[PDB]
Amino acid sequence: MLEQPYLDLAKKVLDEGHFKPDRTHTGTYSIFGHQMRFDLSKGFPLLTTKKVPFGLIKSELLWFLHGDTNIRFLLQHRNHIWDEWAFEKWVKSDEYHGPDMTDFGHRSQKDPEFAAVYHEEMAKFDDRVLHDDAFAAKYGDLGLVYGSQWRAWHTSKGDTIDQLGDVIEQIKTHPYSTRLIVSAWNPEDVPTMALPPCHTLYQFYVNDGKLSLQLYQRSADIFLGVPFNIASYALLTHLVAHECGLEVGEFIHTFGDAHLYVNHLDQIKEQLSRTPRPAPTLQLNPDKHDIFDFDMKDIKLLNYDPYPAIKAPVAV
Amino acid sequence: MLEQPYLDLAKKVLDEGHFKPDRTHTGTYSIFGHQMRFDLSKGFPLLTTKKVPFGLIKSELLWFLHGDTNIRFLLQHRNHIWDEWAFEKWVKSDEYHGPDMTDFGHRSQKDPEFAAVYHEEMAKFDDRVLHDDAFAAKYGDLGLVYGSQWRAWHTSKGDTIDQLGDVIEQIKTHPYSTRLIVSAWNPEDVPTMALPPCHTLYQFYVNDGKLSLQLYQRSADIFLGVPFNIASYALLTHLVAHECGLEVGEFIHTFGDAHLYVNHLDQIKEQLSRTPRPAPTLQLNPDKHDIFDFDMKDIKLLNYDPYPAIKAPVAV
Ligand SMILES: [K+]
Numbered sequence: 164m165l166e167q168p169y170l171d172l173a174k175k176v177l178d179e180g181h182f183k184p185d186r187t188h189t190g191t192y193s194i195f196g197h198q199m200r201f202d203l204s205k206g207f208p209l210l211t212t213k214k215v216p217f218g219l220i221k222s223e224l225l226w227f228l229h230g231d232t233n234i235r236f237l238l239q240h241r242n243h244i245w246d247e248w249a250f251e252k253w254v255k256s257d258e259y260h261g262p263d264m265t266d267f268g269h270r271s272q273k274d275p276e277f278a279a280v281y282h283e284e285m286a287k288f289d290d291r292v293l294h295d296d297a298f299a300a301k302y303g304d305l306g307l308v309y310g311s312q313w314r315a316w317h318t319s320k321g322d323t324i325d326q327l328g329d330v331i332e333q334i335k336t337h338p339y340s341t342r343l344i345v346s347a348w349n350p351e352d353v354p355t356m357a358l359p360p361c362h363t364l365y366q367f368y369v370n371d372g373k374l375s376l377q378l379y380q381r382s383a384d385i386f387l388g389v390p391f392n393i394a395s396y397a398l399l400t401h402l403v404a405h406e407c408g409l410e411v412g413e414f415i416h417t418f419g420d421a422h423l424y425v426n427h428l429d430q431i432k433e434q435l436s437r438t439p440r441p442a443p444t445l446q447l448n449p450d451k452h453d454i455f456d457f458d459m460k461d462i463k464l465l466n467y468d469p470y471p472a473i474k475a476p477v478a479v
Numbered sequence: 480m481l482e483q484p485y486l487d488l489a490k491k492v493l494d495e496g497h498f499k500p501d502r503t504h505t506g507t508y509s510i511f512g513h514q515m516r517f518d519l520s521k522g523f524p525l526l527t528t529k530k531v532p533f534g535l536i537k538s539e540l541l542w543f544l545h546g547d548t549n550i551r552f553l554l555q556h557r558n559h560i561w562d563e564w565a566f567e568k569w570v571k572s573d574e575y576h577g578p579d580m581t582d583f584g585h586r587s588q589k590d591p592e593f594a595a596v597y598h599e600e601m602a603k604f605d606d607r608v609l610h611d612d613a614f615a616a617k618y619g620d621l622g623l624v625y626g627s628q629w630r631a632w633h634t635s636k637g638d639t640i641d642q643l644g645d646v647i648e649q650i651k652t653h654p655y656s657t658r659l660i661v662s663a664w665n666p667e668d669v670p671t672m673a674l675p676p677c678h679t680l681y682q683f684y685v686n687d688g689k690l691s692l693q694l695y696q697r698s699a700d701i702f703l704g705v706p707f708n709i710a711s712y713a714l715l716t717h718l719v720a721h722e723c724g725l726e727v728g729e730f731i732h733t734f735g736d737a738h739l740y741v742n743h744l745d746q747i748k749e750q751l752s753r754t755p756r757p758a759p760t761l762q763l764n765p766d767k768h769d770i771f772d773f774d775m776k777d778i779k780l781l782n783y784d785p786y787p788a789i790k791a792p793v794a795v
Binding site: 181196339341342351354359381413417 | 497499500511513633635636637642658660662664667670675686729736
C-alpha cells in the first residue's frame with residue numbers, strides 16, 4: 164500500500180533504533196539518515212492506519228502560502244498547532260498579568276490543577292489575539308516561521324525575497340533546473356531561535372512533465388509528527404504542480420534524525436498491527452490556479468477511510 | 480566492498496535514468512532522490528576501481544577549513560580545480576588585454592588553435608595571482624565559495640558567522656543535538672551566482688560516541704564529480720571526529736539530481752567491469768588537533784591501490 168514506507172520506517176526505528184537522549188528529557192530510539200518516496204499518482208499519502216486531521220494540515224499550509232506569520236488566521240480556522248509559541252511571548256512579557264506559567268509545558272502534563280489554569284490564560288490569549296487588533300499584532304505575530312522564510316526572506320540590504328514565488332517562476336521558465344531549492348535555514352537567526360526549522364529545505368524536480376519534490380527534515384517525531392509532515396509536503400507538491408500546469412510525480416522525504424519517543428512505543432506497536440486501506444484522493448479547484456490565493460474550499464480530500472485515531476502523550 | 484554503493488548508483492542511473500536535458504547543452508540520464516551510506520570504520524571511500532587524486536581533494540578541503548577564498552593557496556599546491564571561476568573575472572574585466580576568451584569553455588573543447596591560446600592566458604593568469612599580491616587580491620579572490628559560507632557567513636548587520644566553528648563547539652557541548660547543521664545556500668546570493676553551491680548543506684550526528692555526517696547534494700555528476708564529493712565529505716567527517724575526540728560513524732550522501740552525462744557512457748560501463756579492491760586507510764596526525772590549522776602533511780592515506788585512471792570529456 165502507499166503508506167507502507169512510513170510503517171517500514173516505524174519498524175526500522177523499533178529494531179535498529181539506538182536509545183539516544185533528547186532535549187525534552189524524554190528518551191528516544193533514533194536513526195540518522197533515511198529516505199522514503201511516495202508516488203503521488205497512486206494516491207494521497209494521508210495515513211489510513213490512523214486518523215490524521217487534514218483540516219489542520221490544510222489550513223496551516225495555506226497560512227504558509229500566504230506568507231502569513233500571525234496566529235490569528237490559524238485560530239480563525241480552529242487551528243491551535245502554533246498557539247504555544249505565541250503564548251510563550253505573552254507570558255514572558257512585562258504587560259502579562261496572571262498566574263505563573265513558568266514551564267507550562269511539562270508542568271501541565273503533570274499537575275491537573277495547573278493544567279486547568281493553563282487552559283484558561285490560553286483561552287483568554289486566543290480571544291484577545293482574535294478580537295484585539297493591536298494585541299494580535301504584538302503577540303499574535305511569530306515573525307520567523309515558514310511563511311516568512313518561504314515568502315519574505317530578509318536580505319542584508321533590508322529587502323525581502325519571495326523564495327517560493329521566485330522558484331515557481333523558475334519551474335515555468337526552466338523546468339529542467341537543478342537549482343529549484345527553497346531553504347528555511349538561516350544561519351544568522353538559528354542560534355536565537357527556540358525552534359530552528361525542522362523542515363530545513365526542499366527541492367523541486369521536473370522530468371517527463373511530472374513534478375517531484377524532495378524534503379530534507381533534520382529532526383522528526385516518527386509517531387506524532389511524521390504523519391502530518393508527509394501530508395503537508397505531498398499537498399504542497401500538488402498545489403505547485405497545479406499552478407505550473409504539471410502532473411505530479413513523487414514526494415521524497417529525507418531524514419536526518421528520525422526518532423520515536425519512549426512513551427509512543429505501545430501505540431506505534433498497535434498501529435503496526437493494522438492493515439492499510441486504499442489511499443484517499445486529493446481534488447483541487449480546476450478554475451483557480453494562483454495557489455497563493457487558495458482557500459480551504461479549493462482543496463478537497465475524497466475517499467479517506469481511516470482506522471480510529473491513536474492518542475499519545477506529547478514530549479516536552 | 481565499501482565503494483559498492485557508488486557502483487550501484489551508476490548502474491541505477493544507467494537502467495532507470497531518464498534522459499533529461501542540461502545547462503551545458505550536453506545530455507544526461509538522471510534520477511531524483513537517492514541516498515547511500517559509507518561505514519567509515521570499514522575504510523576510507525576513495526574509489527579503487529578508478530584512480531582519484533587525493534592530493535586535490537585534500538588541499539581543497541583545507542583551503543575550505545581555513546575559510547580561504549583565494550585561488551592563490553590552491554595554485555601553490557598545484558590545485559587548479561577553481562582556476563576557471565577566477566579566470567573568468569579576469570577576462571571580463573576592463574583591465575584585461577589579450578585574445579578574446581568568450582566562452583573559452585566549450586570553445587577550447589572544440590578548436591585546438593584556441594585551446595592553445597587559452598592555456599596561455601591562463602598560464603599567465605596563474606602566474607600573476609601567484610606573484611602579484613594586488614593582482615591576487617583582486618582576481619584571485621572568489622568571494623562566495625565554501626570557505627566563506629562555512630567560516631564567514633555574512634549577516635544583515637554587517638558581521639560574519641563562523642558556522643562550522645560554532646557547530647564544532649556544539650558537538651563538544653551538546654553531542655545529542657539535532658541542530659548540528661551547516662548550510663551553504665544563501666537565498667540572497669544564489670540568484671546572482673554563476674554556480675549556487677552543489678553541496679547545499681550537511682548535518683552531523685552523534686550516538687554511542689560515533690560521529691556521522693549527512694550531505695545533501697542538489698546536483699551531481701555521477702562520473703567525474705561524485706568520486707571526489709565522497710572523499711571530501713568522508714574526509715571532513717574524519718577531521719571533525721578527530722577534533723571532537725570522537726570515533727567515526729558513517730557518511731550518508733543524499734542526492735537531489737544525480738546525473739550521468741551522455742559522453743560518459745562507455746567510460747562508466749568500463750569502470751563497472753572492474754572489481755573493487757580493499758579500501759585504503761586514512762591516518763591523521765595524533766599530536767595536532769585544531770583541524771583549522773591542519774596542513775597537507777597532517778593527513779596521510781595508507782594502502783590505496785587503484786585501477787588506472789579513466790579519462791573522460793568534461794561537459795561545458
Ligand atoms: K540555507
